[PDB]
Amino acid sequence: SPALPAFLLCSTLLVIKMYVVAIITGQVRLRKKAFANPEDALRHGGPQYCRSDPDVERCLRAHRNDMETIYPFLFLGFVYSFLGPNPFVAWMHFLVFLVGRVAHTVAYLGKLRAPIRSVTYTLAQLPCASMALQILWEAARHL
Amino acid sequence: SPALPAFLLCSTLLVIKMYVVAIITGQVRLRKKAFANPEDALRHGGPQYCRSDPDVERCLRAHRNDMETIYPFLFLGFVYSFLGPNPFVAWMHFLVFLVGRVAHTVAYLGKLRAPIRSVTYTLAQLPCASMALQILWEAARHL
Amino acid sequence: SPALPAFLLCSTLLVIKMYVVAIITGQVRLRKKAFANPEDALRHGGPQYCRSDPDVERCLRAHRNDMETIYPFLFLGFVYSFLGPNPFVAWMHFLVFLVGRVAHTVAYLGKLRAPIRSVTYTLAQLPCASMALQILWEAARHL
Ligand SMILES: N[C@@H](CCC(=O)N[C@@H](CSCC(=O)c1ccc(-c2ccccc2)cc1)C(=O)NCC(=O)O)C(=O)O
Ligand SMILES: N[C@@H](CCC(=O)N[C@@H](CSCC(=O)c1ccc(-c2ccccc2)cc1)C(=O)NCC(=O)O)C(=O)O
Ligand SMILES: N[C@@H](CCC(=O)N[C@@H](CSCC(=O)c1ccc(-c2ccccc2)cc1)C(=O)NCC(=O)O)C(=O)O
Ligand SMILES: CCCCCCCCO[C@@H]1O[C@H](CO)[C@@H](O)[C@H](O)[C@H]1O
Numbered sequence A, B, C: 001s002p003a004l005p006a007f008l009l010c011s012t013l014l015v016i017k018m019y020v021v022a023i024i025t026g027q028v029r030l031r032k033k034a035f036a037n038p039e040d041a042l043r044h045g046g047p048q049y050c051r052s053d054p055d056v057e058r059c060l061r062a063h064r065n066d067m068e069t070i071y072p073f074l075f076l077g078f079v080y081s082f083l084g085p086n087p088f089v090a091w092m093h094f095l096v097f098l099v100g101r102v103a104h105t106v107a108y109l110g111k112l113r114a115p116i117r118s119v120t121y122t123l124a125q126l127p128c129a130s131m132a133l134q135i136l137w138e139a140a141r142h143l
């Protein structure tokens, strides 16, 4: 499976990119003193710090959007890598996803004007939709 | 692995079903003018459209519930497909999950009376619980 | 792959642990009469029970944090199991994750003082970060 190393490289970079979002979220909570739990707020200055914050909420939305998109790619890309795609075509699917997703997180956390985030989201979903349909046909025909 | 094509067909349909929920959510935000981000609200009419909406919130709950259930199935069903189950028994596990999950999303977004959604949820979790236990025993015995 | 049974045992226990969190959340909603949907509230006593609750919110945060961490482990641990790690070293990665994650959920739902939850979270992420980097290098070198 000549496409497998490319898949594993892109996927693992995206997982690390999600870990970076978790790290950023934690740092933002600490810096803004905005905690979700009274036990956390009390350790960090008092009950008034058990509160929501727009920058924390933004981080959580970026992380959730990652879960909505990167997790399915992990499944789809892995299966697709084993079904014998042209390696260059596979590379292009994986690269468009990687670049689109990294750009999405930059656009989201960086508060870039619309529709920059929505374009990057849509661009990244294209190779996912492609892989899903290709897998669907391969599965269907082996039933 | 005679169960693998059936697994891949059901799983990929469920992923596409999750993409449809993402699409619906976006359309609902646009139609109700209810955006989570000031950059989005400003592109679409002004800051007063940076607001929550019950139909948007409902879409997000359906999508989150999908992530809580479909993602584990993707892992469990894949592993289970390789452990040599009777193919018909495997088919039944996958079909009950697929039908239960599609019904769950229809019940959720369609605002069907309780306990229709909760029944479909519980029904779909049954084959997941079954596969998890079967995998647990197979793993345990190879330790 | 001598590490595979250990991976599948730990992963499947963690999935079951996530199902337990879903079950607890449902029980808490019912016990506190705090539902997210008017159709649910109406079946269970009236519209005033369509409301948020801190214990329900806490359960949802624990479940979300599981999705943020356990799902990537399912991918990373599976790939890592096939790359020929020393089986004892692999066992240690999987065990630290399993124990850290179970402890995280106990700390979260049990409202244990800070920084108990954050320590368990960080400890569990260590083997995940390790596996991710090891996979990154293996993938990179096969490009
Ligand atoms: N969505 C989470 C993200 C941060 C988080 O999960 N925090 C922990 C407390 S630990 C402290 C921390 O912020 C943190 C963040 C990232 C990492 C890390 C990650 C990957 C590799 C290496 C290190 C280590 C520690 C928690 O239990 N949150 C409760 C919850 O999720 O509801 C949040 O809003 O709190
Ligand atoms: N839970 C999300 C769902 C929609 C979404 O993710 N929107 C993007 C902006 S893109 C516009 C769009 O709505 C959209 C939706 C689906 C698709 C699509 C999907 C699959 C295949 C093909 C096409 C393409 C575009 C975002 O960054 N949201 C910010 C966030 O998640 O916090 C939300 O509530 O916004
Ligand atoms: N995060 C969810 C967790 C509970 C849930 O998903 N509830 C269903 C209604 S079903 C009743 C139930 O609570 C329940 C919970 C767990 C299980 C179960 C799980 C695994 C194995 C075996 C059994 C079976 C039933 C729902 O549609 N919630 C709407 C939503 O997620 O927005 C919530 O806050 O409601
Ligand atoms: C590699 C580790 C870097 C992670 C950076 C996050 C640092 C901030 O972590 C903070 O720790 C507190 C401990 O009580 C928690 O209560 C807070 O919720 C959390 O934001």
Ligand SMILES: CCCCCCCCO[C@@H]1O[C@H](CO)[C@@H](O)[C@H](O)[C@H]1O
Binding pocket: A114, A115, A118, B023, B025, B026, B027, B029, B030, B035, B040, B041, B043
């Ligand atoms: C296949 C593509 C169909 C997706 C339908 C979603 C269309 C609505 O997408 C909208 O785009 C805006 C761009 O600025 C965003 O700000 C909004 O959040 C989003 O709802």
Ligand SMILES: CCCCCCCCO[C@@H]1O[C@H](CO)[C@@H](O)[C@H](O)[C@H]1O
Binding pocket: B114, B115, B118, C023, C025, C026, C027, C029, C030, C035, C040, C041, C043
């Ligand atoms: C194995 C099954 C045990 C799951 C325990 C959860 C029981 C509570 O489930 C309740 O069912 C109601 C039905 O209308 C829903 O409206 C509530 O949201 C849900 O909390």
